């Protein structure tokens, strides 16, 4: 009864507050695809995908745009949409980029469904909101920068940090 | 035969490449008295004093200026000048600021004596120049800054560092 009426995507390369240092060098931006799922209820679901490397970014955006044809005019019923996408991609391989694109749809559909019911997603799933302990994630930073980032995270109130080693 | 013919002093508060962090706060400048010891040979000996706190700076400069009267026109013979200053200040107390001022004179007189003989001080003292291992001195810096300063010192080629604790 609530139907999906549109899918818009936007590919962006966005600045990171913490540049990610790697064995190769430092990456300052993240490739994302921002998703807007329009509905017959007027509300729009929002989600996004992380493409990991700019090499995959346009391909992932293109895939989602082409997958729009499968979902526009279907009811906003994420579980049912997921089953349909799983079946449609059973030959191509329901994994990798295809699976990630299907997940972006699913996340936007549940955000829309929360909006249809004017309730936070956690409550729609049947649970109460509760605070959840968070760790601050850093990178392959070496001694100087790992110490600096760890001090900042502790000052912010985090009780754990993650560093990349190797 | 070479005589001291003048003493000039200059009080300065100079910027430190490494601000000194203390339990109280950070000190960005050092109080110095710069010394010029003029001679009948034309060469000028240079030395300086560290006054430790700006509270002592003008007093130390004033003391040296008044001590000029004891040394101008005396032969440039640091060992003999030292004996004379030790005797003249035997009642006042040949220690503390008085002793530091006498040392500034002595250091400038030996620099002048090196110049009279056109030879590096080390050779005048009868030794060969040799490289001497140096450690880089830091302060009460905490974890972030001590790590940062230690990395820099190692990159510069130092094989040791000193940190302030307490
Ligand atoms: O666990 C992570 O967040 C991640 O594996 C990662 C992987 C891929 C994208 C974003 C985060 C990681 C974190 C810190 C250092 C290296 C890797
Ligand atoms: O040994 C030093 O250089 C000194 O004692 C000092 C004392 C007074 C003036 C300059 C240096 C020190 C160094 C690092 C931290 C605290 C103290």
In this complex, is the C-beta atom of B154 within 8 Å of any C-beta atom belonging to chain A? no
Checking B94-103 for CB contacts under 8 A at 24+ apart, the result is B97/B56, B97/B59, B97/B60, B97/B63, B98/B63, B100/B49, B100/B60, B101/B49, B101/B60, B101/B63, B101/B64, B101/B67, B102/B67, B103/B49
Q: Do A45 and A109 contact (CB within 8 A), yes or no?
A: yes
From A21, A32, A160, A164, the mutation candidate for ligand 1 (largest count of ligand atoms within 8 A of CB) is A164
SS3 B31: strand
SS3 B1: coil
Distance from residue B87's CA to the centre of ligand 2 (Å): 31
Distance from residue B24's CA to the centre of ligand 2 (Å): 15
B72-85 exposure pattern, b = at least 16 Cβ within 10 A, e = fewer:
eeeebbbeebbeeb
Distance between CA atoms of B24 and B68, rounded to whole angstroms? 37
Going by C-alpha positions, the residue among A83, A78, A19 that lies closest to residue A47 is A78
> What stretches of chain B adopt beta strand conformation (E)?
4-21, 26-39, 44-50, 136-137, 161-162
Q: Do B159 and B148 contact (CB within 8 A), yes or no?
A: no
For atom 17 of ligand 2, the residue with the nearest CA is B164
Distance between CA atoms of A32 and A10, rounded to whole angstroms? 8
| DSSP sequence for chain A | --BEEEEEEEEEEEEEEEEEE-SS-EEEEEEEEEEEEEETTS-EEEEEEE-SSHHHHHHHHHHHHHHHHHHTTSBS-HHHHHHHHHHHTTTT-SSHHHHHHHHHHHHHHHHHHHHHTTS-HHHHTT---------EE--S-HHHHHHHHHHHHHHTT-S-EE----
Indicate whether residue A164 lines ligand 1 (CB < 6 A): yes
**How many residues would you count in chain A?**
166
Going by C-alpha positions, the residue among B153, B138, B150, B66 that lies closest to residue B101 is B66
Q: Is the C-alpha dihedral spanning B148, B150, B151, B157 positive or negative? A: positive
Distance between CA atoms of B163 and B147, rounded to whole angstroms? 10
Phi, psi of A96 (to 5 degrees): 55, -145
Phi, psi of A31 (to 5 degrees): -85, 115
Q: Which residues contact A99 (CB under 8 A, 6 or more apart)?
A: A89
For atom 8 of ligand 2, the residue with the nearest CA is B52
B144:A143 CB<8 A: no
Q: Is A76 left (phi over 0), alpha (psi -120 to 50) or beta?
A: beta
Going by C-alpha positions, the residue among A76, A73, A35, A32 that lies closest to residue A54 is A32
Residue in chain B nearest A150 by alpha carbon: B144
Q: What are the Cα distances from residue A113, in Å, to A36, A74, A105?
A: 13, 14, 12
Q: Which residues contact A163 (CB under 8 A, 6 or more apart)?
A: A138, A139, A140, A141, A146, A150
Extract the tokens encoding B116: 């009279």
Neighbours of B101 (CB within 10 A): 25
Residue in chain A nearest B143 by alpha carbon: A147
Q: What are the Cα distances from residue A49, in Å, to A38, A71, A127?
A: 17, 17, 25
CA angle B28, B33, B35 (to 5 degrees): 140
Atom number of ligand 2 nearest to Cα B52: 9
Q: Do A89 and A98 contact (CB within 8 A), yes or no?
A: yes
Residue written as token pair 């030395």: B47
Distance between CA atoms of A77 and A87, rounded to whole angstroms? 16
Phi, psi of B69 (to 5 degrees): -55, -30
Distance between CA atoms of B16 and B27, rounded to whole angstroms? 9
β partners of residue B75:
B3
Residue in chain A nearest B149 by alpha carbon: A144
Experimentally determined by: X-ray
Residue written as token pair 């931006």: A29
Torsion of CA B117, B121, B123, B125, to 10 degrees: 100
CA distance B41 to chain A (A): 53
Q: Which residues contact B79 (CB under 8 A, 6 or more apart)?
A: none
Distance from residue A18's CA to the centre of ligand 1 (Å): 12
Set of chain A residues whose Cβ sits within 8 Å of the Cβ of B143: 147, 151
Phi, psi of B51 (to 5 degrees): -90, -5
Set of chain A residues whose Cβ sits within 8 Å of the Cβ of B144: 147-148, 151
Q: Do B70 and B85 contact (CB within 8 A), yes or no?
A: yes
Set of chain A residues whose Cβ sits within 8 Å of the Cβ of B138: none
Extract the tokens encoding A11: 């590919």
- Which residues 87-146 on chain B approach chain A with CB closer than 8 angstroms? 143-144
Q: What are the Cα distances from residue A143, in Å, to A24, A165, B94, B136, B147?
A: 17, 11, 49, 19, 7
What secondary structure, in 3-state letters, does A76-105 show?
A: CCHHHHHHHHHHHCCCCCCCHHHHHHHHHH
In this complex, is the C-beta atom of B155 within 8 Å of any C-beta atom belonging to chain A? no
Distance from residue A104's CA to the centre of ligand 1 (Å): 19
B104-118 exposure pattern, b = at least 16 Cβ within 10 A, e = fewer:
bbbbbbbbbbbbbee
Residue written as token pair 């994994």: A95
CA angle A99, A52, A10 (to 5 degrees): 75
Indicate whether residue A139 lines ligand 1 (CB < 6 A): yes
- The CATH architecture of the domain made up of A1-118 is 2-Layer Sandwich (3.30)
CA angle A164, B149, A138 (to 5 degrees): 20
CA distance B132 to chain A (A): 28
Going by C-alpha positions, the residue among B99, B121, B118, B101 that lies closest to residue B110 is B121
Set of chain A residues whose Cβ sits within 8 Å of the Cβ of B147: 143-144, 147
Q: What are the Cα distances from residue A43, in Å, to A3, A35, B98, B150?
A: 11, 13, 84, 56
What angle separates helix B54-71 from helix B78-88, to the nearest 10 degrees?
110
């Amino acid at each position: 009864e609530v139907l999906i009426t549109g899918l818009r995507t936007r590919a962006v390369n966005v600045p990171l507050a913490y540049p990610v240092h790697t064995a190769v060098g430092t990456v300052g931006t993240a490739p994302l695809v921002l998703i807007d799922l329009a509905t017959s209820a007027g509300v729009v679901g929002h989600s996004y995908l992380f493409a990991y490397t700019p090499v995959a970014l346009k391909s992932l955006k293109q895939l989602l745009d082409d997958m729009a044809a499968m979902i526009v005019n279907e009811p906003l019923a994420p579980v049912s949409l997921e089953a349909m996408l799983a079946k449609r991609f059973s030959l191509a391989g329901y994994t990798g980029l295809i699976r990630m694109a299907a997940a972006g749809i699913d996340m936007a559909a549940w955000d829309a469904l929360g909006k249809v019911h004017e309730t936070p997603l956690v409550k729609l799933l049947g649970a109460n909101a509760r605070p959840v302990q968070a760790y601050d994630s850093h990178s392959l930073d070496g001694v100087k920068l790992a110490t600096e980032r760890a001090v900042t995270a502790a000052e912010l109130g985090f009780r754990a940090v993650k560093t990349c080693i190797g």
